[PDB]
Amino acid sequence: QSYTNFTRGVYYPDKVFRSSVLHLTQDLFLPFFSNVTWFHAISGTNGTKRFDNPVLPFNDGVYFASTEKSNIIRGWIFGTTLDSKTQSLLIVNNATNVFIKVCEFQFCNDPESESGVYSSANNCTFEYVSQPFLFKNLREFVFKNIDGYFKIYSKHTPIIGRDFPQGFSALEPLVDLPIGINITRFQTLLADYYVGYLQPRTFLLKYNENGTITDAVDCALDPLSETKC
Amino acid sequence: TLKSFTVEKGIYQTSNFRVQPTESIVRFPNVTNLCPFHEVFNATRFASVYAWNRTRISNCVADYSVLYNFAPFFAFKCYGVSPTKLNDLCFTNVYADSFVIKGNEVSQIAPGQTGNIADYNYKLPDDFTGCVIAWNSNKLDSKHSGNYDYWYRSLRKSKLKPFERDISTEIYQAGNKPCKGKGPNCYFPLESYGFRPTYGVGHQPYRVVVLSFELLHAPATVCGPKKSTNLVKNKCVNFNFNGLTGTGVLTKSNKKFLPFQQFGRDIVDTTDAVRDPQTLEILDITPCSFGGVSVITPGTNTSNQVAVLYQGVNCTEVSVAIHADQLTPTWRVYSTGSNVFQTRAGCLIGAEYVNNSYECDIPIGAGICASYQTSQSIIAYTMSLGAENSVAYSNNSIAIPTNFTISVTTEILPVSMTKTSVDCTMYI
Amino acid sequence: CGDSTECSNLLLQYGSFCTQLKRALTGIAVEQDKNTQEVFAQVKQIYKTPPIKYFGGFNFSQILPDPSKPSKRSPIEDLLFNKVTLADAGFIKQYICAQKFNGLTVLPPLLTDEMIAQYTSALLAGTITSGWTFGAGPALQIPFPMQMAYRFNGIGVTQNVLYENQKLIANQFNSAIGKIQDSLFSTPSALGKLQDVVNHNAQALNTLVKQLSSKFGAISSVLNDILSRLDPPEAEVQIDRLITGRLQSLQTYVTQQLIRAAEIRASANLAATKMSECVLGQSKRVDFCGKGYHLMSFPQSAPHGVVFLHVTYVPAQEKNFTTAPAICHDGKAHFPREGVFVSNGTHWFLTQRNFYEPQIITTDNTFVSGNCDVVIGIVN
Amino acid sequence: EAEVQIDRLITGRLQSLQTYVTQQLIRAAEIRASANLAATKMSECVLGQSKRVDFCGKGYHLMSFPQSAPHGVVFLHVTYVPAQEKNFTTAPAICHDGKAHFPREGVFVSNGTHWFLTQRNFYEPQIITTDNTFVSGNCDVVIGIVN
Amino acid sequence: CGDSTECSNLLLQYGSFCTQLKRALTGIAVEQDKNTQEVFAQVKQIYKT
Ligand SMILES: *[C@@H]1O[C@H](CO)[C@@H](O[C@@H]2O[C@H](CO)[C@@H](O[C@@H]3O[C@H](CO)[C@@H](O)[C@H](O)[C@@H]3O)[C@H](O)[C@H]2NC(C)=O)[C@H](O)[C@H]1NC(C)=O
Ligand SMILES: *[C@@H]1O[C@H](CO)[C@@H](O[C@@H]2O[C@H](CO)[C@@H](O[C@@H]3O[C@H](CO)[C@@H](O)[C@H](O)[C@@H]3O)[C@H](O)[C@H]2NC(C)=O)[C@H](O)[C@H]1NC(C)=O
Ligand SMILES: *[C@@H]1O[C@H](CO)[C@@H](O[C@@H]2O[C@H](CO)[C@@H](O[C@@H]3O[C@H](CO)[C@@H](O)[C@H](O)[C@@H]3O)[C@H](O)[C@H]2NC(C)=O)[C@H](O)[C@H]1NC(C)=O
Ligand SMILES: *[C@@H]1O[C@H](CO)[C@@H](O[C@@H]2O[C@H](CO)[C@@H](O)[C@H](O)[C@H]2NC(C)=O)[C@H](O)[C@H]1NC(C)=O
Ligand SMILES: *[C@@H]1O[C@H](CO)[C@@H](O[C@@H]2O[C@H](CO)[C@@H](O)[C@H](O)[C@H]2NC(C)=O)[C@H](O)[C@H]1NC(C)=O
Ligand SMILES: *[C@@H]1O[C@H](CO)[C@@H](O)[C@H](O)[C@H]1NC(C)=O
Ligand SMILES: *[C@@H]1O[C@H](CO)[C@@H](O)[C@H](O)[C@H]1NC(C)=O
Ligand SMILES: *[C@@H]1O[C@H](CO)[C@@H](O)[C@H](O)[C@H]1NC(C)=O
Ligand SMILES: *[C@@H]1O[C@H](CO)[C@@H](O)[C@H](O)[C@H]1NC(C)=O
Ligand SMILES: *[C@@H]1O[C@H](CO)[C@@H](O)[C@H](O)[C@H]1NC(C)=O
Ligand SMILES: *[C@@H]1O[C@H](CO)[C@@H](O)[C@H](O)[C@H]1NC(C)=O
Ligand SMILES: *[C@@H]1O[C@H](CO)[C@@H](O)[C@H](O)[C@H]1NC(C)=O
Ligand SMILES: *[C@@H]1O[C@H](CO)[C@@H](O)[C@H](O)[C@H]1NC(C)=O
Ligand SMILES: *[C@@H]1O[C@H](CO)[C@@H](O)[C@H](O)[C@H]1NC(C)=O
Ligand SMILES: *[C@@H]1O[C@H](CO)[C@@H](O)[C@H](O)[C@H]1NC(C)=O
């Protein structure tokens, strides 16, 4: 239920192109070898059984990854209460398009084809539609809520690479939603997955000739990492 | 440079040269959608201070002449970007916080200040950039019976965090009694202030809009108006790419930017690339050529002819800058054929290079020295190291002196220097 | 205040700080050429070796210029050059990928590497052909084995030792040169003393450029942004804050360059002293020019410096002998004129101090002063 | 406001003094190094005869004389410079009765008809005798021995 | 400014000053050990009377 060996979650912190450099930056990152919870005990149909599927806290930001070929995970819900008392953000990934909405979702499908996706959306403040996102392809996402913006980063790495830490790759920003939303908890929406949490850290990021991040050092992990930084 | 009307023989370091720009390039987004300031400033109603109307403005052209057309203002209160000449900037994020406040609390809207508004209803960051723009709305918001659609949260448990609001209306609790309902000395939080047309100026309503500006070069833009022009490459120009202003030479880049990325940086955190907002082409920015200038003078007691060394550049670029009237120093030299020579140090103009070697006189660098020789003109040459003297080495030959010279030489060494003392207090 | 006239006008109010910094850097730049000239330009004339590179059997092919390869440098000089030239922009070259082009210009040396190589070649040809005579007056040719014989006398070893062992000495010299070349080739750290100098100067410039990105209390580190966003009366405050920070950074750079210049000057003066005393002569100063008794030295050029090959005589294979301060004969005390009395256990001989070569004790090798009673430990 | 303007002037003057003193300390170190060299030269060139090449001027050192100067010292170095050399034929040893004869001092030279021993730094030919040379080994060991 | 976060955040606006001082003092410390080693460690063997 807890996988200790996580060295992934590095993402491009800004719009700055760098080439053949090592850049030291302070941002929210998943710490290296931080305890990360693996939700295999309560996974799919035989996990939740239309029950449990616990709501997790959202401390500064989270790291999410999926290894489920069937795409049972369709989206995420974010907010503080999630019963219409406060606003909540939904990002459901449909096969045709990704539908991101911010509304007072009193009702949701959360308590095998044509599963229910009903929501009440009693009052809406934001709507956005984008290209669809949809084993041999591991899907990594980072979700952080900073200064009124919900920043989503991802990588649909084609890696057939079944071992979870098969290799290192940095995530690229996917969308930056201008949502002034207070987020303290979130839940995974199903029609397995890993969830880790971000902390403020300083990292040394290695940019290659093409400006792709190929490695990183977590400056607080070990005396050797401090020496490298 | 030497503060003298007499110059000794030698090479002297003078001011540096730069290639001047010849064009001004503005590349703002090709957006004709005017930012909705009129709909916010000229609104039918403003929200109460309790829950100000926060309108996000993006993907539009900022125009602040709308504000001068709207009304004369009480105050702009611009911080971080002090002038009202905001049409020259590109902002990453723009927020318009709209509310109606009473006159005696307008002064409470500063980034750092005290009072019931500054402390409990609307809080700005102390390092905030933006403008707080006020308008007198007595003629619109005041009513004879009183306009009771506005209130203040004067009773609060804790200080309001900047740009963060919890709009719960739960009655304030005090003491060890729950204070659930009316009757105890705990009162409902909102003030209920009523704006009357018969009130004095300090009690009249004002419509205040806070324009929060995020200036971070230009990873995103809300740009003011300018008339854009075409790109000209391989020339020194003054460019403005959205809010990124600078001078340089724009060339095609060979960098592979991510679709996400717009700007590049070198190892010294200086801009070295930009994505063009109208074409999405990635351009390299090269500094315009510059370098030191040195003057080689035989000495004014011999000749007034001098040679000029432009350090750090190729003579092709110097000749182009002279012909284009781009070179920063306004003086010129004849620059005729046979008087331009490329050295490792730079471009030497005003000296004729010869294939003879001589002892070095005025050093230039990388082996090239110059002197004034015959009719007389400044020449440049590769310095001689000494005379050659092959020695007749043999298996069985030795040279033995037969005579000698008694030589006296002079060696001079400093031993001491002037001893000084300073009265720190009297001096300063 | 790059391309900003408001900033330049404010900078003018601080006085002659630029004059002092410019003059300090100019003085350093001139001093570096003085140091190079003092170390290498010690020869009145450019001396050349004979067409026939035969010097008693000594092989100098790895220290003499190689006429085939471009630059006319020796194999060792070429190795030193290829090993330490890790600076991408150590001089203008008729032209950090930007090479610190933020108003910071690197100047070329006055003497190029080929001209320094020519001075080194002249010094080597002089030393090989004429020993130390070219360093005092005119060059006087001498056969190399005789030059070595007199250097052996210089270290207290009789001339016959070289001639009897000339083949041994030439082979040991040639082997030592080959070993030196292989040692320098296979040990990248050997030249660290010169590489550190290059690295320190690179750091000095890299940091100075990086200081431009600092705000020093200003709202922005970019003058164009300050002027665009602020009206003149506030822009002047933010600009003064940046002027103070950048000017302090320049003063720090110049102070450290002056200190480093003093260190380099001291090193150059030491190098010039070593060249004058060990290349143009034979030194008697212990460990001044290598371990062992000094015989000769050979200069080699290197980027930003000089490498000396010091050829010394090292005693080997010592044996224990019984000694005595004097010999008692006919009541007289006989002392060595040039040597030590030794015994192999049955017979007494007189030998030279630096090489066992037993002689018969005779009246032509000793002197007499006093009787046999005054000397402590006298042997019959 | 005067407090602000005065503090700016104080900062400028104090920084100017720090710059002056730092440069004076560096120049003082340079002068100290020069003075130490001058004292060494005084001790080794004036109070004795030096064998260090080019330490006490060009040529072979004979003696030096100090002279004072403002803020410093001037040394007059008197040296011996060889002149008017002649090129003679030489040999490492003379072979006589099978013995190899080496010079005690000097070098063997020849004018083309006779061999002489001469002091290395001044041509002054002497007859080669058993008092001027020493014997070690024989004529079959030394390379280039002449009869 | 010891044990103060606010001053540390302002101090970071002056650049690499602290790094330059660390390099200068470390270089001095190493130089002093080099000087002692160069003066006294001139013999490769420990001789005894
Ligand atoms: C002075 O010493 C150098 C070496 O330090 C001599 O040059 C060397 O000469 C030998 C001659 O046999 C070269 O050997 C070569 O070996 C290769 C195979 O390894 C063979 O294919 C060649 O045909 C040749 O036999 C050796 O490479 C060469 N080394 C260098 C660095 O040049 C030089 O000849 C000596 N001079 C005198 C006058 O003794
Ligand atoms: C100390 O040194 C002396 C002198 O070298 C040694 O005495 C010498 O020993 C050699 C040994 O070969 C004697 O050589 C003799 O030559 C004749 C030639 O006809 C031969 O017939 C003999 O059989 C012998 O080989 C030499 O004469 C002799 N000289 C004297 C004066 O005794 C001595 O042995 C050495 N002692 C030690 C402990 O090393
Ligand atoms: C090499 O040097 C030797 C000796 O210095 C030269 O031999 C000497 O040459 C001189 C002539 O210059 C001879 O002088 C003659 O002396 C006799 C004495 O009776 C006199 O009658 C003659 O009129 C003349 O003055 C001297 O005797 C002679 N000595 C010997 C031992 O031969 C030799 O000529 C020199 N060779 C060269 C090529 O320089
Ligand atoms: C060297 O020889 C002399 C004699 O030629 C020795 O002197 C004698 O020493 C003995 C010692 O008992 C005396 O009794 C004699 O009277 C001495 N004679 C003379 C003439 O002095 C001397 O001792 C010898 N030295 C050594 C070290 O053996
Ligand atoms: C010096 O003289 C000796 C003889 O006294 C020469 O030795 C002879 O050399 C020849 C060859 O040149 C041999 O054939 C003889 O057998 C040798 N004789 C003896 C007794 O050794 C010697 O060569 C002469 N050296 C010179 C340089 O002339
Ligand atoms: C370490 O990672 C591997 C996957 O490479 C995983 O199987 C293993 O359980 C991990 N060990 C932990 C979580 O301590
Ligand atoms: C950049 O990516 C391309 C992708 O095809 C690759 O071929 C190229 O080699 C990369 N750049 C470098 C410097 O390797
Ligand atoms: C703008 O304000 C004026 C009053 O100053 C009003 O008459 C006009 O209708 C408003 N126009 C709008 C809101 O479009
Ligand atoms: C703010 O006022 C504008 C005026 O047009 C309106 O469109 C917008 O919905 C208002 N928002 C809130 C949260 O009151
Ligand atoms: C955000 O939600 C948390 C949930 O505990 C609450 O304490 C906090 O006050 C909320 N903030 C805002 C601005 O709504
Ligand atoms: C406006 O800019 C966009 C940028 O992608 C470009 O595609 C479009 O053609 C431009 N339109 C005009 C009329 O310039
Ligand atoms: C010296 O002798 C050797 C013997 O082989 C010869 O090759 C060489 O050419 C001689 N030197 C001169 C200068 O004649
Ligand atoms: C100077 O620039 C021209 C441009 O055509 C080039 O051909 C020439 O080689 C350059 N010279 C040097 C020394 O860089
Ligand atoms: C011979 O010399 C060696 C030198 O290390 C010494 O150890 C040994 O004891 C000596 N033997 C005698 C008998 O003097
Ligand atoms: C050496 O002496 C010979 C005559 O013995 C003469 O021909 C030759 O020119 C001399 N060489 C020199 C360099 O003086």
Numbering used by the authors:
A (entry chain A): 26 to 30, 32 to 65, 68 to 139, 154 to 176, 186 to 210, 212 to 243, 264 to 301
B (entry chain C): 302 to 482, 484 to 676, 689 to 742
C (entry chain A): 743 to 837, 850 to 1134
D (entry chain C): 988 to 1134
E (entry chain B): 743 to 791
Text taken from the publication that reported this structure:
The JN.1-sublineage KP.3.1.1 recently emerged as the globally prevalent SARS-CoV-2 variant, demonstrating increased infectivity and antibody escape. We investigate how mutations and a deletion in the KP.3.1.1 spike protein (S) affect hACE2 binding and antibody escape.
KP.3.1.1 contains only one additional change compared to KP.3, a deletion in the NTD (S31Δ). Compared to the JN.1 spike protein, KP.3 carries two mutations in the RBD (F456L and Q493E) and one mutation in the S2 domain (V1104L). S (S31) and KP.3.1.1 S (S31Δ) in both “one RBD up” and “all RBD down” states revealed similar overall conformations and no change in intra-domain distances (Cα RMSD = 1.1 Å and 0.9 Å, respectively), indicating that S31Δ and N30 glycosylation did not induce any substantial conformational changes. CryoSPARC 3D variability analysis demonstrated that all spike proteins had similar proportions of up and down RBDs, suggesting that S31Δ does not influence the conformational dynamics of the spike protein. Our results demonstrated that S31Δ indeed induces a fully glycan-occupied N30 glycosylation site in all of the variants carrying the S31 deletion, including JN.1.11 + S31Δ, JN.1.11.1 + S31Δ, JN.1.11 + Q493E + S31Δ, and KP.3.1.1.
